[PDB]
Design a protein around this ligand. Structure first.
Ligand SMILES: O=P([O-])(O)O[C@H]1O[C@H](COP(=O)(O)O)[C@@H](O)[C@H](O)[C@H]1O
Ligand SMILES: O=P([O-])(O)O[C@H]1O[C@H](COP(=O)(O)O)[C@@H](O)[C@H](O)[C@H]1O
Ligand SMILES: O=P([O-])(O)O[C@H]1O[C@H](COP(=O)(O)O)[C@@H](O)[C@H](O)[C@H]1O
Ligand SMILES: O=P([O-])(O)O[C@H]1O[C@H](COP(=O)(O)O)[C@@H](O)[C@H](O)[C@H]1O
Ligand SMILES: OC[C@H]1O[C@@H](O)[C@H](O)[C@@H](O)[C@@H]1O
Ligand SMILES: OC[C@H]1O[C@@H](O)[C@H](O)[C@@H](O)[C@@H]1O
Ligand SMILES: OC[C@H]1O[C@@H](O)[C@H](O)[C@@H](O)[C@@H]1O
Ligand SMILES: OC[C@H]1O[C@@H](O)[C@H](O)[C@@H](O)[C@@H]1O
Ligand code: NA
Ligand code: NA
Ligand code: NA
Ligand code: NA
Lengths: 899, 899
């Protein structure tokens, strides 16, 4: 018996105590939290990688899929077909391909050219080349994943070292190998670890399976973790499978007290020195070689084969795990040990076969014990998550060592149970291996990918190319020309209305003026005091007055009676009732003007629709309302568009400002044009500010080119169908409606809100400028997005919040680009009118959407620079409102008249 | 009585019950949580802005300071003196500069010019323009601050509306205006809110002060918050003052059930419509106007003055909060009301005076109650943070309304104390104002700014400009020439040694080869099998052997005996000892060679110093050690540098790979040069690979220009003082030591580790390549950095961690750039030598620092591309090791002698 007592004490270090296993286990439980923490993850050795698999198969999966399996003992390719609907039962064929150590160790090219060729052949046999089966990919290596169909190789392990793969996306690398053949096509929908595939396979048969275990060439385990614990994944909803990658357990010296001189030497001779340390003590790629080392040691010390040592006993890999197994058998063990040991050149005795068969026991028993330590850690984790006092679950398993060894399973289980008493665990052995689980993943992954493709196809219609935008620019310019030239003005959609403001402030403006601001989100009355000279100052006061929607769409008389009533109140408010003051009337609607003080409303726009107003001079309408009330008397000097009023406001201090831009409720622009071009106003001397009214761009159909199903719905249900089409693709009154219609469509398709269109989503105007702006704020937590939505009335999930956010971004991005294409046309025209190679010009801007949106102005600016590279445009924010400019305009109006 | 009854039911909406107050208080409670949360902040109206003030005065403050105060009712500039020393401990003089509405409502340029002018006048009179008086700046508006000397205006409030300021750093704007004047200098070191200044001023006299409160023109409050609750500021250590900006409470509609029609009208006539709604129900700017609006509503409805109404009564601002106070006098109350109302043109009856007074009562009382609810929320907050049942604290207060109203203070206090039962609260009125507290902040800020200045000065010596880098390149080029021309060679520091490898692999290499890899972090022996012809493959194995340090520095006899001891062990490992296999020897130290198999160690580098090696032929040394053991025999065909081996490994695949680079323990480079230039070896036909041994670059003082005090310490304490200087600014064995010496320096200065040089910090090697790479990892958590450092033995606060990271980054960046200037010199030589206008070449790279560092390679590549534009360099990473390239050299060698 000293035959055994001897070795046992010699290999003292490789016989782990139950107390020791407990320590290891506790230490792995910690390593898990480190891998799951967003703070310690970057440093942790156990990477706890997220897999993006939400749960084991339920039986709804159906279709036809191809699965690849590389990184294991065999490079296999299967075909899984399932459709319970038709009563097809899970069915699958497979085939194994030869892969020499040469390829596994060559360039990434060779390897993936080999895989692409093997897939080509596998599909040629079943002749499925035609046909578009979704491909799954079991890749048994630690991988960086942001989505299920992406796999950045973190590091080769086991038998692989292929140059130019680590830190690359194996999905992309594989694809490249395929396309290079042009032999066929392949839609790689997913990549999973073999642990994950194994968990899914057993999960399919055992609804309790919450763990995936692999103990073959290498070792590693995955399990079902709570989202509320996966710091590195946005969400708290449900659970996700986490590939622990515990092979690298101790790669940082965590297990230096457990490792032995034998582990350190196998390490020094390994393909990946210093890495996968915990694994190098466990998996069947190392076990046999670890034994051969322990023997050589003894033999050199004469404890075996007398003192004998042969070139074979020293040759790396002469002692397989196959032998560790064959020698472990109950009846044929010693007989096998004899044969194997004999072929080693040595003259083994029956005493030797007994000693050697025992070394295999100490090395074989340790591995099983270590795994029981770590797997016990996982189980503890689970029981914790559940809250249940006891634990009951299934553990999928696989791997040559676990399958073939005649003592491993039996031992490992026993130890695990002992370590974890309150755990009622069943071990289910994957038979199809990873493949069925892989297919069950691919199915879910393909299904989700189909939605994405459809969502992307729809959203793609909102994407405009550099060239499309140049066309838009070009069409805008053409329309401008049409509006200016009198022989074509009557049919031009872009009216190019003269404002009769011939110059920006010259600093001689002086006096006290009243002003109106009507047409924006706020109607207001102002008092503006302007003083010129050495000491120039501007003093203003505002009061916002509400206009009830009823009235806003009542009669002309009502509307202006209300306006005049509000003026009356304001005059009282400023304590200035009595004297007849000059008034600048900012009226944000297309007006045909014959002089500064006359403007005939061409048509209502935005939300305004008062009766008996269109066709009337709004200055006349105001004067009438003033006379009717007969309290005070005013001297209406001018009617001005908000674009023009805004440009003048900014021009006050910025003499390079010759363009006005509004992006708020509506959208429109104005600029200084040469009189020789304003064919609609007699005279070709000096300049005139032109109110473009560019919102009507596209009203003749010149944009049907880029308008979508959703734009037409918005236009068709508006107060002014067929009109202001360009504006309806840009301004804050409409962007929300575009988004809303997209969401209604997506919900019906079943992509959003469980496919149930809430009463809220049917409410028009729900997505106000304010909401759109909040939704798109950068680095905003999905949690916050979901909060905003639910606070509107939309009960959405994280996935929904993402989609909604993507939709808002696409609509607002397009609005910014379209706006930029228009502005691009404008500045380029100015540049040419001036005969310049390069033009510096500033635009005075205002509008709630422009001010609030976190991306609009940025993207709009980038677009203008991109489309008119010969112009350097500066955008200047108006912070005083149009009233200031209107007052400045009224001043010049009073002087000129006074002549 | 009958009167008070009527009014009471008419303004019932403004009579706030305690239940309501408690409700409002709970509301503010939640708003605080939202403002502090990283998730909800972007949508919270209560911004909870960090102030970067860690605590109230600790008594160590002293110096002469200037303080600005803008945003209150008076623009004020002060001078504060604090010394110990003298006493008068705190002495201060101030002046109030007139600031008309025009300045407050005009351009930002004009506003800050005005401020800069006043600051000038103030400094002129005190003739202190020449002193270095630090300036603190009290700016009472909500600001975004990442550091105490930065203040980005979020929004104007109260009476201010100056264009071009919101979204800008007011510190920059002010400096800008100051530099425009060219009148003087101003070191603005800190910006604080008036709440903060108040808290610090009161905190100076009362060490229990934890809150600063303002109830004047506007209303706000700050308080000491735990850092663990401040999501937007990384850190959990200590506390920081939080500026709540509670004026904007309700701006999202959260208080619409509290706001009345009168509040809504006040808003519509306000300078900031829709903003600071809570503030508009509270502060002195609004209370009076709020009263006037109510008198108007009543007069119209007949409830006051027989229904009489006058122009003065209807005018904005005619009823000041000053009248509200006077009319609430105890006192002349009804009397004062008589006169105020009599000036308003109305015909006030004694009952009118009573009615009016009771109105003022409701309005002002609501204000005090609202403030008590929000302050209560803060008090409750402070208590929970302590975790105690009772709370004792002092609230610093200031503001005209609170100082002058005859009832407010009393009512506010009573209600507050009622809302927060278990708390003893002292209200300490700040009589001196914000100046004293501002100066206190300025003292600490300045002290800190001084440390930053010194740190930035030191680190600045590691910054290299584009132009400096071009010089390094130029100098490198000259050194290369010296090394190549035989007339300057002997004295040249960059040796440009010949390797006697004349061509990259031609693809015909074939056979089995032994290889040795000595000089890197790992000593190893490799077996390389190169099959060429139709099919070309490369199968290689290897084992790592340790070399015990003594031996590394013992005798050439022992070193090479060990080397051979290992070579033998490996032959057994591969199970092939008998044949005289050809061997490639990678020895990475400068070697003077006459043939491919002759290598005379010129000098040791890195950590090697075995005796009786230098001056010998390392091949002769190896051949001896082999002959002594007598066990077996081999045929050493060549001795190669790791740069040459690496180049050949990478050029096996890439035919444009004509350059080698190593950035690991040491740093060096080789390249294919033209024999016409290799003056040291006979002939001018074909090419020759030159091992530059560029590490010695600078050993003749040519870099003394950029070497720092820390470079000199590292060099002077090394095993090879005065040699490998360039390498000592680049490679992994040294960078850590540069950082360590900087840290020791900063620690003595007292910038780091509480000025305690630990035993750990005194240990050399502490900052190994591995650690340097972890600590600089992108988007890594500060917590993670502190963890790594703490695990080294260094007790580091979060600030410490910031500095150490910054230091590591400065050092690695310079290393990458210096390396880049070297490569730029090399490639550009190839180009010029081959009379090309553009050159495309790839460089084979290896080395742990290069592989592990998160930025080195990226920055290096960038520098190469910037300094040698006419060159397009590709960096192919070697994953096979130098052994492969060595075997490729052996091959060609073995062929040459028979052939
Ligand atoms: O073992 P197989 O070929 O059925 O393959 C099965 O087990 C392997 C692990 O064990 P080994 O490394 O011994 O292959 C897994 O990697 C593979 O995904 C699975 O299909
Ligand atoms: O928005 P406000 O009231 O400051 O008003 C400002 O911008 C409006 C457009 O933007 P929106 O339609 O978003 O109001 C203009 O019509 C208005 O003249 C201008 O003073
Ligand atoms: O009031 P001051 O000039 O002593 O100034 C004091 O109180 C002001 C607030 O109260 P108000 O808005 O009523 O001025 C603060 O802004 C100022 O920092 C403080 O020194
Ligand atoms: O680093 P290894 O062991 O792969 O070794 C590799 O890199 C070393 C440089 O880098 P370091 O000094 O960091 O080792 C080289 O000297 C060695 O020839 C090469 O095979
Ligand atoms: O194949 C079993 C295991 O081998 C390990 O080396 C890999 O890192 C794992 O991804 C895999 O699960
Ligand atoms: O308010 C911005 C713009 O809205 C457009 O719909 C109106 O037709 C324009 O007159 C106005 O400039
Ligand atoms: O001055 C008292 C308060 O007024 C508010 O309107 C400002 O936003 C605060 O920054 C300031 O503390
Ligand atoms: O091993 C990397 C480099 O280290 C330098 O210090 C040595 O002098 C070189 O021979 C070598 O190329
Ligand atoms: Na999560
Ligand atoms: Na004309
Ligand atoms: Na913090
Ligand atoms: Na020569």
């Amino acid at each position: 018996d000293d035959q055994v007592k001897k070795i046992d004490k010699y290999l003292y270090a490789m016989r782990l105590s139950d107390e020791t296993l407990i320590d290891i286990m506790t230490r792995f439980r910690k390593e898990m939290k480190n891998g799951l923490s967003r703070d310690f993850n970057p440093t942790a050795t156990v990477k706890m990688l997220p897999t993006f698999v939400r749960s084991i198969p339920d039986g709804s999966e159906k279709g036809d899929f191809i699965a690849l399996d590389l990184g294991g003992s065999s490079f296999r390719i299967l075909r899984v077909q399932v459709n319970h609907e038709k009563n097809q039962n899970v069915h699958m064929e497979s085939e194994v391909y030869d892969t020499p150590e040469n390829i596994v160790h060559g360039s990434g090219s060779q390897l993936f050219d080999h895989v692409a060729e093997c897939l080509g052949d596998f599909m040629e046999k079943r002749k499925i080349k035609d046909k578009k089966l979704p491909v799954g990919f079991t890749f048994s290596f630690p991988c960086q994943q942001s989505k299920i169909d992406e796999a950045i190789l973190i590091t080769w392990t086991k038998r692989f070292k292929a140059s130019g793969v680590e830190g690359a996306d194996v999905v992309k690398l594989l694809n490249k190998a395929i396309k290079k053949r042009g032999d066929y096509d392949a839609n790689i929908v997913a990549v999973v670890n073999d642990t994950v595939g194994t968990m899914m396979t057993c999960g399919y048969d055992d609804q309790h399976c919450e763990v995936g275990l692999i103990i073959g060439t290498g070792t590693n385990a995955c399990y079902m973790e709570e989202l509320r614990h996966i710091d590195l994944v946005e969400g708290d909803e449900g659970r996700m499978c986490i590939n622990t990658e515990w092979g690298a357990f101790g790669d940082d010296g965590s297990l230096e007290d457990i490792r032995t001189e034998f582990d350190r030497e196998i390490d020094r001779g390994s393909l990946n020195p210093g890495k996968q340390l915990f694994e190098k003590m466990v998996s069947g790629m190392y076990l046999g070689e670890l034994v051969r080392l322990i023997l050589v040691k003894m033999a050199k010390e004469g404890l075996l084969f007398e003192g004998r040592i042969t070139p074979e006993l020293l040759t790396r890999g002469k002692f397989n795990t196959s032998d560790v197994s064959a020698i472990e058998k109950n009846k044929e063990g010693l007989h096998n040990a004899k044969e194997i040991l004999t072929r080693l050149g040595v003259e083994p005795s029956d005493d030797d076969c007994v000693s050697v068969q025992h070394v295999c026991t100490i090395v074989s028993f340790r591995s099983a014990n270590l795994v029981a330590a770590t797997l016990g850690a996982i189980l503890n984790r689970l029981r914790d998550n559940k809250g249940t006092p006891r634990l009951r679950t299934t553990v999928g398993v696989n791997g040559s060592l676990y399958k073939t060894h005649p003592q491993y399973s039996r031992r490992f289980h026993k130890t695990l149970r002992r370590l974890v008493p309150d755990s009622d665990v069943r071990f289910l052995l994957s038979e199809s291996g990873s493949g069925k689980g892989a297919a069950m993943v691919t199915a879910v992954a393909y299904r989700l990918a189909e939605q994405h493709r459809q969502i992307e196809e729809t959203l793609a219609h909102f994407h405009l190319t550099k060239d499309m935008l140049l066309e838009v620019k070009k069409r805008m310019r053409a329309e401008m020309e049409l509006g200016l030239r009198k022989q074509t003005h009557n049919n031009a959609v872009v009216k190019m209305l003269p404002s009769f403001v011939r110059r920006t402030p010259d600093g001689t403006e002086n006096g006290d003026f009243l002003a109106l601001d009507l047409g924006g989100t706020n109607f207001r009355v102002l008092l503006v005091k302007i003083r010129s000279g050495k000491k120039r100052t501007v003093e203003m006061h505002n009061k916002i007055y509400a206009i009830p929607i009823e009235i806003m769409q009542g009669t002309g008389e009502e509307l202006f009676d209300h306006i005049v009533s509000c003026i009356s109140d304001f005059l009282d408010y400023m304590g200035i009732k009595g004297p007849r003051m000059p008034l600048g009337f900012t009226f944000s609607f297309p007006c045909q003007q014959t002089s500064l003080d006359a403007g005939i409303l061409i048509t209502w726009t935005k939300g305004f629709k008062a009766t008996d107003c269109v066709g009337h001079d709004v200055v006349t309408l105001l004067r009438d309302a003033i006379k009717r009330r007969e309290e005070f008397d005013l001297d209406v000097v001018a009617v001005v568009n908000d674009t023009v009023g805004t440009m003048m406001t900014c021009a006050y201090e910025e003499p390079t400002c010759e363009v006005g831009l509004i992006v708020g409720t509506g959208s429109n622009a104005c600029y200084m044009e040469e009189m020789k071009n304003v064919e609609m106003v007699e005279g070709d001397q000096g300049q005139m500010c032109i109110n473009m009214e560019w919102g009507a761009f596209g009203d003749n159909g010149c944009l049907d080119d880029i308008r979508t199903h959703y734009d037409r719905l918005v236009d068709e249900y508006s107060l002014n169908a067929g009109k202001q089409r360009y504006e309806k693709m840009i301004s804050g009154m409409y962007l929300g409606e575009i988004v809303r219609n997209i969401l209604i469509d997506f919900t019906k398709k079943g992509f959003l809100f469980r496919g149930q269109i809430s009463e809220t989503l049917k409410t028009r105007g729900i997505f106000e400028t304010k909401f759109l702006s909040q939704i798109e704020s950068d680095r905003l937590a999905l949690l916050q997005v979901r909060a905003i939505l639910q606070q509107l009335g939309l009960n959405s999930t994280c996935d929904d919040s993402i989609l909604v956010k993507t939709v808002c971004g696409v609509v607002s991005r397009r609005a910014a680009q379209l706006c930029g294409a228009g502005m691009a046309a404008v500045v380029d025209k100015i540049r040419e009118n001036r005969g310049l190679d390069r033009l510096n010009v500033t635009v005075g801007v205002d509008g709630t959407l422009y001010k609030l949106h976190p991306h609009f102005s940025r993207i709009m600016h980038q677009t203008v620079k991109e489309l008119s590279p010969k112009c350097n445009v500066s955008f200047l924010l108006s912070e005083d409102g149009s009233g200031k400019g209107a007052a400045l305009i009224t001043a010049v109006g009073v002087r000129l008249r006074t002549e």
